[PDB]
């Protein structure tokens, strides 16, 4: 069970890579956040911009991009292999994520055998 | 010559003991390395004016902290009324 922040990015302002502000919104909410050095670096690494729907893990700070919102100006003729348009999330900006999955002991062994051991769960080169 | 930092280690009687000293040529370097910053201040725990619960969000348009979607709707309605009245 993990607490997450989930919303659509409205504005990203960075002053100078030292300090900045991030604005996130839902269909029922909107707030602004003060960013640090590592958060700014992570946002720049993932190339998060306006219109992107992202989730941020509060504990670890990792950012994964769910999709981007559709506007009249985003009628692309060609799309990348990973881009997809999703609806703006509803509800509250802070959410709890509960994940239940079944794995075997061998899978955990293969995961922890090497740095990217989860690849051997597909290749079998354990 | 120039602006330098002098690192010094000596042998002095206490039968002898070692002491280290750091010498700054100019006061600017000393201030830069030792700003003598005062302790920081604890931020004021903001509270939502609508529901009086501890604040968790901050509406960028109104800069009014809030902790509920209903509080956000009320704040935005108040801002719309303010725009309508003042113009």
């Amino acid at each position: 069970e993990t607490e997450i922040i989930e919303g659509e990015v409205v504005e990203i302002q960075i002053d100078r890579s030292k300090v900045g502000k991030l604005t996130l919104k839902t269909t029922e909410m909107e707030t602004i956040y003060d960013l640090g050095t590592k958060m700014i670096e992570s946002l720049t690494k993932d190339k998060v911009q306006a219109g992107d729907v992202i989730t941020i893990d509060k504990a670890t700070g990792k950012i994964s991009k769910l999709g981007r919102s559709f506007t009249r100006a985003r009628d692309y003729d060609a799309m990348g292999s990973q881009t997809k348009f999703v609806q703006c999330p509803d509800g509250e900006l802070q959410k709890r994520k509960e994940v239940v999955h079944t794995v075997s002991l061998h899978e955990i062994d293969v995961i922890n055998s090497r740095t990217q051991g989860f690849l051997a769960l597909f290749s079998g080169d354990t | 010559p120039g602006p330098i930092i002098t690192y010094h280690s000596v042998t002095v009687p206490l039968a002898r003991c070692s002491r280290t000293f750091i010498t700054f040529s100019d006061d600017a370097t000393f201030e830069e390395w030792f700003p003598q910053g005062r302790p920081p201040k604890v931020p004021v725990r903001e509270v939502c004016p609508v529901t009086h619960r501890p604040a968790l969000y901050r509406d960028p348009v109104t800069d009014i902290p809030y902790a509920t979607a209903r509080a956000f709707k009320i704040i935005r309605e108040a801002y719309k009324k303010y725009i309508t009245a003042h113009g």
Binding site: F70, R72, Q87 | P60, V61, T62, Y79
Partner: peptide, 27 residues
């Protein structure tokens, strides 16, 4: 929950541009 639909896509495409975002006001 948040997959787009053809109806929503058509509505957004046909609708005019959204009004400009209001400037922040210290209140």
């Amino acid at each position: 929950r948040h997959r787009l639909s053809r109806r929503v896509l058509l509505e957004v495409a046909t609708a005019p541009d959204p009004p400009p975002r209001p400037k922040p006001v210290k209140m």
